[PDB]
């Protein structure tokens, strides 16, 4: 694998890479799982909330509307 050198691939860099690369995958993850569950938790909310509000809103004037005519 072109790696009889074995000079240019030293241990500084693989550990470097082991914790550097860890730490990028946890808050990676960490912060992907925050934004997604944040988005899709408001985006639920609030489409429930418009839903609700709206049908309750016209249900509520075709109602009234109807029991006073």
């Given at each position: 694998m072109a790696s009889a050198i074995t000079?240019?691939?030293?241990?500084?860099?693989?550990?470097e890479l082991n914790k550097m690369q860890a730490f990028i995958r946890?808050?990676?993850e960490e912060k992907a799982k925050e934004?997604?569950?944040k988005a899709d938790?408001?985006?639920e909310i609030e489409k429930t909330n418009?839903?609700?509000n709206e049908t309750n809103n016209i249900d509520g004037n075709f109602k009234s509307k109807l029991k006073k005519a």
């Amino acid at each position: 694998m072109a790696s009889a050198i074995t000079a240019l691939t030293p241990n500084q860099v693989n550990d470097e890479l082991n914790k550097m690369q860890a730490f990028i995958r946890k808050e990676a993850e960490e912060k992907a799982k925050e934004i997604q569950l944040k988005a899709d938790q408001e985006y639920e909310i609030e489409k429930t909330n418009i839903v609700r509000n709206e049908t309750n809103n016209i249900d509520g004037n075709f109602k009234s509307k109807l029991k006073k005519a």
